[PDB]
Amino acid sequence: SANLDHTKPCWYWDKKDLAHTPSQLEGLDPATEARYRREGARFIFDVGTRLGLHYDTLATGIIYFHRFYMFHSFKQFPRYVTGACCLFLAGKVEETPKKCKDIIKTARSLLNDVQFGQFGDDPKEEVMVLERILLQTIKFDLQVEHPYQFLLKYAKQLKGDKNKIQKLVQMAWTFVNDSLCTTLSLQWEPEIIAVAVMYLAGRLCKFEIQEWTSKPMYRRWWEQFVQDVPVDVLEDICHQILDLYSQGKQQMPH
């Protein structure tokens, strides 16, 4: 959904297209969709963290969840059951598997009765059934890359005060986690999110990253890592992350 049909294993949409998700087409308010996405993401993060899963596994589950709701509505598919299913699938793909049973017990421990009521009378079965729909929906395209690897690789190429750079990376890593609550992973490649979270940390701390480039350059510092990315794109990404800290966002893109 969002735009055409044929931009599905091109897994990227303009923010504009995000006004046309299945849920919005069915009448759901943009702010409510945004909240359901943040709630589902944080649920996958919390469940996965309780199960001790590696951060790349939590991120893969969240990317599957965001892609799922480009083709189906929150009206039909309760968000926490999708979250559980996406984490279950991601643990298999990333070779850190967990029993469905254990994901369910963990969900029960973190959700109140009304939230856990989404799982119905047979929670394990609801998740196992949904996995088939999930796999078809994400076109069995299971391998995903996240911004964290690129944040580390690019920061390693910065030459300057080790303590300012360390701080930049710690702040930027928090911003990558935060970005997983938004639809940013459906808008830009993970290399561009990594440069944007470094750009955001630099702006917040008044750090001149341009001064840490290993050789002097005419063009914008990030042009050594990604090609033809205008500053306006980095600023858009920044604003969408900072929205999470300004109240509780609920700005579902358009």
mmCIF file of C-alpha atoms in Angstrom:
data_model
loop_
_atom_site.group_PDB
_atom_site.id
_atom_site.type_symbol
_atom_site.label_atom_id
_atom_site.label_comp_id
_atom_site.label_asym_id
_atom_site.label_seq_id
_atom_site.Cartn_x
_atom_site.Cartn_y
_atom_site.Cartn_z
ATOM 1 C CA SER A 1 0.000 0.000 0.000
ATOM 2 C CA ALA A 2 0.996 3.682 0.363
ATOM 3 C CA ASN A 3 1.876 3.964 -3.337
ATOM 4 C CA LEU A 4 0.965 1.700 -6.348
ATOM 5 C CA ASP A 5 1.278 -1.911 -5.530
ATOM 6 C CA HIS A 6 4.675 -2.218 -7.219
ATOM 7 C CA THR A 7 6.979 -0.727 -4.554
ATOM 8 C CA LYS A 8 7.036 -3.797 -2.242
ATOM 9 C CA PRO A 9 10.470 -5.455 -2.585
ATOM 10 C CA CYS A 10 11.571 -1.870 -3.081
ATOM 11 C CA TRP A 11 10.934 -1.515 0.627
ATOM 12 C CA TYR A 12 11.085 2.321 0.585
ATOM 13 C CA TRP A 13 8.242 4.865 0.463
ATOM 14 C CA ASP A 14 8.188 8.615 0.494
ATOM 15 C CA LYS A 15 6.865 10.108 3.692
ATOM 16 C CA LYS A 16 3.987 11.378 1.474
ATOM 17 C CA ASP A 17 2.912 7.812 0.705
ATOM 18 C CA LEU A 18 2.633 7.059 4.331
ATOM 19 C CA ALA A 19 -0.735 8.942 4.343
ATOM 20 C CA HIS A 20 -2.018 5.962 2.323
ATOM 21 C CA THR A 21 -1.309 3.026 4.519
ATOM 22 C CA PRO A 22 -4.004 0.350 4.732
ATOM 23 C CA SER A 23 -5.025 1.593 8.190
ATOM 24 C CA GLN A 24 -5.401 5.241 7.038
ATOM 25 C CA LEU A 25 -7.288 4.094 3.860
ATOM 26 C CA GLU A 26 -9.740 2.350 6.269
ATOM 27 C CA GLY A 27 -10.170 5.555 8.223
ATOM 28 C CA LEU A 28 -7.785 5.297 11.110
ATOM 29 C CA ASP A 29 -6.484 8.637 12.275
ATOM 30 C CA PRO A 30 -2.768 9.328 11.427
ATOM 31 C CA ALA A 31 -1.994 10.028 15.056
ATOM 32 C CA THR A 32 -3.532 6.758 16.216
ATOM 33 C CA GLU A 33 -1.539 4.803 13.568
ATOM 34 C CA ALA A 34 1.634 6.508 14.739
ATOM 35 C CA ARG A 35 0.872 5.567 18.356
ATOM 36 C CA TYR A 36 0.127 1.939 17.435
ATOM 37 C CA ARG A 37 3.461 1.728 15.587
ATOM 38 C CA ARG A 38 5.384 3.194 18.545
ATOM 39 C CA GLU A 39 3.561 0.881 20.991
ATOM 40 C CA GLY A 40 4.248 -2.190 18.818
ATOM 41 C CA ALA A 41 7.884 -1.300 18.405
ATOM 42 C CA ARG A 42 8.422 -0.677 22.065
ATOM 43 C CA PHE A 43 6.628 -3.965 22.815
ATOM 44 C CA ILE A 44 9.042 -5.916 20.567
ATOM 45 C CA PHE A 45 11.953 -4.114 22.130
ATOM 46 C CA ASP A 46 10.690 -4.886 25.708
ATOM 47 C CA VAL A 47 9.846 -8.537 25.066
ATOM 48 C CA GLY A 48 13.087 -9.169 23.219
ATOM 49 C CA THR A 49 15.124 -7.423 25.943
ATOM 50 C CA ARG A 50 13.443 -9.657 28.632
ATOM 51 C CA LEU A 51 14.378 -12.712 26.553
ATOM 52 C CA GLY A 52 17.977 -11.409 26.306
ATOM 53 C CA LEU A 53 17.922 -11.180 22.488
ATOM 54 C CA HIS A 54 20.623 -9.293 20.631
ATOM 55 C CA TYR A 55 19.755 -5.709 19.504
ATOM 56 C CA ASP A 56 19.941 -6.593 15.777
ATOM 57 C CA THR A 57 17.252 -9.253 16.362
ATOM 58 C CA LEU A 58 14.959 -6.712 18.090
ATOM 59 C CA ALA A 59 15.512 -4.339 15.100
ATOM 60 C CA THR A 60 14.753 -7.048 12.530
ATOM 61 C CA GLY A 61 11.495 -7.846 14.306
ATOM 62 C CA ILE A 62 10.567 -4.151 14.303
ATOM 63 C CA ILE A 63 11.350 -3.795 10.572
ATOM 64 C CA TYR A 64 9.132 -6.810 9.813
ATOM 65 C CA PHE A 65 6.367 -5.179 11.917
ATOM 66 C CA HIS A 66 6.590 -1.810 10.067
ATOM 67 C CA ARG A 67 6.558 -3.586 6.653
ATOM 68 C CA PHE A 68 3.561 -5.747 7.694
ATOM 69 C CA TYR A 69 1.395 -2.671 8.352
ATOM 70 C CA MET A 70 2.143 -1.261 4.871
ATOM 71 C CA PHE A 71 -0.084 -4.154 3.590
ATOM 72 C CA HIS A 72 -2.597 -4.738 6.444
ATOM 73 C CA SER A 73 -4.605 -2.625 8.860
ATOM 74 C CA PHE A 74 -4.362 -2.283 12.562
ATOM 75 C CA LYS A 75 -8.167 -2.661 12.442
ATOM 76 C CA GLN A 76 -7.827 -6.283 11.402
ATOM 77 C CA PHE A 77 -4.496 -7.279 12.929
ATOM 78 C CA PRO A 78 -3.971 -6.534 16.615
ATOM 79 C CA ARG A 79 -0.629 -4.891 17.095
ATOM 80 C CA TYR A 80 0.848 -6.924 20.002
ATOM 81 C CA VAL A 81 0.112 -10.287 18.336
ATOM 82 C CA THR A 82 1.942 -9.019 15.210
ATOM 83 C CA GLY A 83 4.771 -7.831 17.364
ATOM 84 C CA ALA A 84 5.154 -11.215 18.998
ATOM 85 C CA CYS A 85 5.046 -12.980 15.636
ATOM 86 C CA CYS A 86 7.627 -10.633 14.098
ATOM 87 C CA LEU A 87 10.004 -11.188 17.032
ATOM 88 C CA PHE A 88 9.466 -14.968 16.818
ATOM 89 C CA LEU A 89 10.350 -14.933 13.116
ATOM 90 C CA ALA A 90 13.303 -12.575 13.570
ATOM 91 C CA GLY A 91 14.866 -14.865 16.260
ATOM 92 C CA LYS A 92 14.825 -17.694 13.739
ATOM 93 C CA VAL A 93 16.304 -15.594 10.947
ATOM 94 C CA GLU A 94 19.046 -14.070 13.042
ATOM 95 C CA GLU A 95 19.859 -17.498 14.491
ATOM 96 C CA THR A 96 18.857 -16.540 18.036
ATOM 97 C CA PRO A 97 15.614 -18.525 18.216
ATOM 98 C CA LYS A 98 13.122 -18.586 21.071
ATOM 99 C CA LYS A 99 10.142 -20.795 21.586
ATOM 100 C CA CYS A 100 6.842 -19.279 20.720
ATOM 101 C CA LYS A 101 5.718 -20.433 24.158
ATOM 102 C CA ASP A 102 8.394 -18.266 25.804
ATOM 103 C CA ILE A 103 7.576 -15.170 23.757
ATOM 104 C CA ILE A 104 3.924 -15.598 24.848
ATOM 105 C CA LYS A 105 4.789 -15.984 28.562
ATOM 106 C CA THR A 106 6.955 -12.916 28.266
ATOM 107 C CA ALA A 107 4.166 -10.961 26.564
ATOM 108 C CA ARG A 108 1.730 -11.982 29.306
ATOM 109 C CA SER A 109 4.166 -10.705 31.864
ATOM 110 C CA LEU A 110 4.449 -7.266 30.237
ATOM 111 C CA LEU A 111 0.878 -6.639 29.052
ATOM 112 C CA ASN A 112 -2.263 -5.880 31.041
ATOM 113 C CA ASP A 113 -5.401 -8.031 30.580
ATOM 114 C CA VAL A 114 -6.978 -5.831 27.915
ATOM 115 C CA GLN A 115 -3.732 -5.678 25.901
ATOM 116 C CA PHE A 116 -3.112 -9.404 26.262
ATOM 117 C CA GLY A 117 -6.772 -10.001 25.230
ATOM 118 C CA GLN A 118 -5.557 -9.306 21.672
ATOM 119 C CA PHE A 119 -4.061 -12.853 21.689
ATOM 120 C CA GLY A 120 -7.509 -14.444 22.159
ATOM 121 C CA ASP A 121 -8.184 -17.855 23.607
ATOM 122 C CA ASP A 122 -5.125 -19.507 22.096
ATOM 123 C CA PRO A 123 -2.132 -17.128 22.073
ATOM 124 C CA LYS A 124 0.483 -19.567 20.678
ATOM 125 C CA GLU A 125 -1.813 -20.563 17.830
ATOM 126 C CA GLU A 126 -2.660 -16.986 16.916
ATOM 127 C CA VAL A 127 1.062 -16.234 16.584
ATOM 128 C CA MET A 128 1.785 -19.420 14.554
ATOM 129 C CA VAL A 129 -1.133 -18.716 12.215
ATOM 130 C CA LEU A 130 -0.055 -15.163 11.710
ATOM 131 C CA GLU A 131 3.522 -16.187 10.836
ATOM 132 C CA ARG A 132 2.288 -17.616 7.524
ATOM 133 C CA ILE A 133 0.549 -14.337 6.691
ATOM 134 C CA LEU A 134 3.649 -12.377 7.831
ATOM 135 C CA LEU A 135 5.996 -14.370 5.601
ATOM 136 C CA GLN A 136 3.815 -13.926 2.557
ATOM 137 C CA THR A 137 3.426 -10.247 3.304
ATOM 138 C CA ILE A 138 7.135 -9.484 3.571
ATOM 139 C CA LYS A 139 7.651 -11.595 0.405
ATOM 140 C CA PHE A 140 9.962 -13.978 2.220
ATOM 141 C CA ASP A 141 12.544 -11.187 2.107
ATOM 142 C CA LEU A 142 14.053 -11.843 5.541
ATOM 143 C CA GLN A 143 17.552 -10.452 5.455
ATOM 144 C CA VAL A 144 17.700 -6.855 6.711
ATOM 145 C CA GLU A 145 20.491 -4.482 7.641
ATOM 146 C CA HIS A 146 20.227 -1.834 10.370
ATOM 147 C CA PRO A 147 21.870 1.508 10.912
ATOM 148 C CA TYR A 148 23.986 0.453 13.953
ATOM 149 C CA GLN A 149 26.682 -1.305 11.847
ATOM 150 C CA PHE A 150 27.101 1.770 9.658
ATOM 151 C CA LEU A 151 27.148 4.214 12.649
ATOM 152 C CA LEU A 152 30.113 2.215 14.017
ATOM 153 C CA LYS A 153 31.917 1.960 10.676
ATOM 154 C CA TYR A 154 31.533 5.636 9.853
ATOM 155 C CA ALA A 155 32.427 6.904 13.349
ATOM 156 C CA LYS A 156 35.633 4.860 13.118
ATOM 157 C CA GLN A 157 36.704 7.070 10.169
ATOM 158 C CA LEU A 158 36.369 10.267 12.200
ATOM 159 C CA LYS A 159 39.639 11.648 13.508
ATOM 160 C CA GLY A 160 39.528 14.030 16.496
ATOM 161 C CA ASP A 161 38.801 14.201 20.246
ATOM 162 C CA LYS A 162 38.102 10.600 21.292
ATOM 163 C CA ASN A 163 35.773 11.727 24.084
ATOM 164 C CA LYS A 164 33.579 13.954 21.898
ATOM 165 C CA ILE A 165 33.461 11.148 19.277
ATOM 166 C CA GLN A 166 32.549 8.503 21.888
ATOM 167 C CA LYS A 167 29.748 10.802 23.128
ATOM 168 C CA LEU A 168 28.605 11.336 19.509
ATOM 169 C CA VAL A 169 28.350 7.593 19.012
ATOM 170 C CA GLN A 170 26.523 6.957 22.309
ATOM 171 C CA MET A 171 23.939 9.694 21.527
ATOM 172 C CA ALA A 172 23.591 8.513 17.891
ATOM 173 C CA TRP A 173 23.048 4.891 19.018
ATOM 174 C CA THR A 174 20.156 6.012 21.270
ATOM 175 C CA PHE A 175 18.712 7.892 18.231
ATOM 176 C CA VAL A 176 18.883 4.695 16.139
ATOM 177 C CA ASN A 177 16.852 2.886 18.825
ATOM 178 C CA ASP A 178 14.381 5.791 18.880
ATOM 179 C CA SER A 179 14.107 5.834 15.051
ATOM 180 C CA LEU A 180 12.751 2.219 15.242
ATOM 181 C CA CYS A 181 9.542 3.651 16.767
ATOM 182 C CA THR A 182 8.916 5.691 13.650
ATOM 183 C CA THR A 183 8.469 4.657 9.983
ATOM 184 C CA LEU A 184 12.006 5.923 9.161
ATOM 185 C CA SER A 185 13.151 2.390 8.235
ATOM 186 C CA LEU A 186 10.407 2.419 5.489
ATOM 187 C CA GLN A 187 11.710 5.777 4.171
ATOM 188 C CA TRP A 188 15.517 5.655 4.037
ATOM 189 C CA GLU A 189 18.309 3.085 3.768
ATOM 190 C CA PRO A 190 20.094 2.268 7.005
ATOM 191 C CA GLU A 191 23.328 3.990 5.785
ATOM 192 C CA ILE A 192 21.389 7.254 5.493
ATOM 193 C CA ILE A 193 19.754 6.836 8.922
ATOM 194 C CA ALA A 194 23.283 6.256 10.377
ATOM 195 C CA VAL A 195 24.604 9.497 8.894
ATOM 196 C CA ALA A 196 21.444 11.351 10.041
ATOM 197 C CA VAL A 197 21.758 10.218 13.680
ATOM 198 C CA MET A 198 25.461 11.324 13.645
ATOM 199 C CA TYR A 199 24.359 14.665 12.147
ATOM 200 C CA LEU A 200 21.648 14.985 14.860
ATOM 201 C CA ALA A 201 24.061 14.196 17.718
ATOM 202 C CA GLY A 202 26.567 16.704 16.265
ATOM 203 C CA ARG A 203 23.873 19.474 15.999
ATOM 204 C CA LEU A 204 22.661 18.844 19.601
ATOM 205 C CA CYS A 205 26.167 18.949 21.073
ATOM 206 C CA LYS A 206 27.470 21.704 18.757
ATOM 207 C CA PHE A 207 30.184 19.322 17.466
ATOM 208 C CA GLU A 208 31.669 20.196 14.028
ATOM 209 C CA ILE A 209 31.931 16.741 12.488
ATOM 210 C CA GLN A 210 33.238 18.354 9.251
ATOM 211 C CA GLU A 211 36.432 19.019 11.307
ATOM 212 C CA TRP A 212 36.951 15.329 12.111
ATOM 213 C CA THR A 213 37.171 14.130 8.469
ATOM 214 C CA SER A 214 40.366 12.152 7.875
ATOM 215 C CA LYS A 215 41.355 14.254 4.878
ATOM 216 C CA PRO A 216 40.013 17.755 4.168
ATOM 217 C CA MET A 217 36.980 17.878 1.849
ATOM 218 C CA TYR A 218 35.030 20.481 -0.117
ATOM 219 C CA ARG A 219 31.719 18.745 0.154
ATOM 220 C CA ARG A 220 29.543 17.845 3.152
ATOM 221 C CA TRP A 221 31.384 15.397 5.517
ATOM 222 C CA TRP A 222 28.824 12.636 4.988
ATOM 223 C CA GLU A 223 29.542 12.547 1.252
ATOM 224 C CA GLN A 224 32.450 10.186 2.046
ATOM 225 C CA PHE A 225 29.931 7.624 3.263
ATOM 226 C CA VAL A 226 26.700 8.099 1.153
ATOM 227 C CA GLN A 227 26.319 9.621 -2.270
ATOM 228 C CA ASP A 228 24.043 12.486 -3.238
ATOM 229 C CA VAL A 229 22.203 12.936 0.013
ATOM 230 C CA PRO A 230 21.085 16.541 0.445
ATOM 231 C CA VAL A 231 21.148 18.139 3.857
ATOM 232 C CA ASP A 232 17.378 18.584 3.663
ATOM 233 C CA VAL A 233 17.041 14.802 3.870
ATOM 234 C CA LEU A 234 19.122 14.688 7.043
ATOM 235 C CA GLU A 235 17.105 17.495 8.557
ATOM 236 C CA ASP A 236 13.785 15.743 7.768
ATOM 237 C CA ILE A 237 15.048 12.609 9.543
ATOM 238 C CA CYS A 238 16.187 14.663 12.512
ATOM 239 C CA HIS A 239 12.774 16.281 12.849
ATOM 240 C CA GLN A 240 11.047 12.928 12.781
ATOM 241 C CA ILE A 241 13.250 11.589 15.591
ATOM 242 C CA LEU A 242 12.964 14.765 17.719
ATOM 243 C CA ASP A 243 9.138 14.544 17.362
ATOM 244 C CA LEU A 244 9.305 11.549 19.665
ATOM 245 C CA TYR A 245 10.773 13.759 22.440
ATOM 246 C CA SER A 246 8.320 16.597 21.789
ATOM 247 C CA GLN A 247 5.256 15.318 23.625
ATOM 248 C CA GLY A 248 4.676 11.781 22.279
ATOM 249 C CA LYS A 249 4.871 12.291 18.472
ATOM 250 C CA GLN A 250 1.763 10.757 16.794
ATOM 251 C CA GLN A 251 2.742 12.417 13.555
ATOM 252 C CA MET A 252 2.223 9.685 10.978
ATOM 253 C CA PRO A 253 4.034 11.023 7.852
ATOM 254 C CA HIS A 254 2.479 12.613 4.761
#
